[PDB]
Amino acid sequence: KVSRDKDGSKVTTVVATPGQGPDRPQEVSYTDTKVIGNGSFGVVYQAKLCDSGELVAIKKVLQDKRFKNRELQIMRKLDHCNIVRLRYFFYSSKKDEVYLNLVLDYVPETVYRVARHYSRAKQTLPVIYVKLYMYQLFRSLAYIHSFGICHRDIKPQNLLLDPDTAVLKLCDFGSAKQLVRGEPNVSYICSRYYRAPELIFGATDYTSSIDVWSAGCVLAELLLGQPIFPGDSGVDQLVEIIKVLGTPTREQIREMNPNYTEFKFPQIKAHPWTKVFRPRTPPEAIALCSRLLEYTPTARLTPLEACAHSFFDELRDPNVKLPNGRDTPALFNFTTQELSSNPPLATILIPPHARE
Numbered sequence: 001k002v003s004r005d006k007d008g009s010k011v012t013t014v015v016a017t018p019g020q021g022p023d024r025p026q027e028v029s030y031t032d033t034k035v036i037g038n039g040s041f042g043v044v045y046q047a048k049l050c051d052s053g054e055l056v057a058i059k060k061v062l063q064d065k066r067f068k069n070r071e072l073q074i075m076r077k078l079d080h081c082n083i084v085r086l087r088y089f090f091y092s093s094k095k096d097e098v099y100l101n102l103v104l105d106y107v108p109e110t111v112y113r114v115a116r117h118y119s120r121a122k123q124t125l126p127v128i129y130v131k132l133y134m135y136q137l138f139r140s141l142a143y144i145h146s147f148g149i150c151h152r153d154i155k156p157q158n159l160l161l162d163p164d165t166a167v168l169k170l171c172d173f174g175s176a177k178q179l180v181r182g183e184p185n186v187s188y189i190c191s192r193y194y195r196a197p198e199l200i201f202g203a204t205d206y207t208s209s210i211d212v213w214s215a216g217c218v219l220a221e222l223l224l225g226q227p228i229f230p231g232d233s234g235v236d237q238l239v240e241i242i243k244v245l246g247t248p249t250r251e252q253i254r255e256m257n258p259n260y261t262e263f264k265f266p267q268i269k270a271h272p273w274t275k276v277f278r279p280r281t282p283p284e285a286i287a288l289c290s291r292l293l294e295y296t297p298t299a300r301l302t303p304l305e306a307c308a309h310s311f312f313d314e315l316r317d318p319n320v321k322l323p324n325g326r327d328t329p330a331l332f333n334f335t336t337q338e339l340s341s342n343p344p345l346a347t348i349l350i351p352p353h354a355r356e
């Protein structure tokens with residue numbers, strides 16, 4: 001690194017490799033560096049790029065140079081406008097230790113912080129924001145699932161937001177992995193409340209539909225004003241699930257983890273979904289929640305099928321505007337890659353007033 005002091009302000013200069021494009025490192029300078037987060041894996045800083053002036057996030061993470069970094073491999077491959085961009089990366093130094101640094105988009109808000117304000121004010125988030133945020137999350141999932149990549153930690157904190165533009169960036173791919181059928185996967189990924197039933201059961205043969213379950217939990221949380229399946233333990237989470245979905249059937253238990261077929265379960269009958277939410281809740285939203293929070297993983301909607309759900313129809317009306325008067329983000333510029341899982345769905349996703 002190189003530390004200048006233009007007008008006393010500390011300036012860092014590093015030869016950083018761009019994320020996308022060809023492997024051609026560049027001299028990059030930034031200042032105004034301050035810590036804005038700490039995780040189990042490292043610290044995340046905020047900084048100002050010394051030329052463009054734009055704000056960025058820098059994620060410092062220790063790198064044992066023995067193996068490649070899985071997060072870096074996935075982040076360089078991804079390029080989607082609902083996923084936090086990897087602008088650059090570089091290495092630095094604690095002693096005799098190498099650190100990998102990821103320079104990413106700075107995004108000022110998160111879904112968690114927006115939902116908590118409304119919750120503290122005893123206020124419900126307007127459904128237009130629920131449609132906007134949910135749609136962009138599912139679109140980001142449809143894009144990464146097309147590549148076989150499972151995020152595995154979908155949670156409201158991980159959904160960044162620009163409140164002016166209403167644009168959602170999915171972030172933290174440190175738990176993401178390309179899921180190969182037949183090969184086993186660690187079962188202790190995903191955070192509380194948003195863990196799929198198969199993950200609570202410790203299943204190692206799970207699929208990308210666990211991201212769809214977590215998304216259904218985030219949708220239900222936005223409608224309810226609080227997490228739908230809370231609990232400090234697996235039993236507590238499972239009971240809150242069983243109180244809604246009813247007790248799982250023998251076949252459904254075999255679709256998550258057969259190794260849990262003979263165990264004893266709380267024997268509660270299915271509470272009808274309409275009685276789970278507030279009375280003025282849109283029925284199309286309740287319908288979508290029911291199609292994502294299904295016991296059998298193969299029965300859950302795909303992210304692309306979710307984007308085409310009737311709940312998001314208001315996003316396709318030509319007259320839709322943001323509450324603050326601006327235009328909605330670009331919700332229809334689907335690449336054929338995004339539509340890989342089902343291209344015929346494009347007749348619904350891309351509306352007649354958005355073609356050429």
Ligand SMILES: O=C(O)c1ccc2c(c1)nc(Nc1cccc(Cl)c1)c1ccncc12
Pocket residue numbers: 036037038039042043044057059084104105106107108160171172173174
């Ligand atoms: O990992 C990424 O991909 C990733 C990507 C972007 C951000 C991030 C993590 N973490 C942020 N901050 C943050 C907030 C709380 C805890 C922690 Cl550890 C970090 C942050 C802030 C503003 N804009 C973008 C980001």
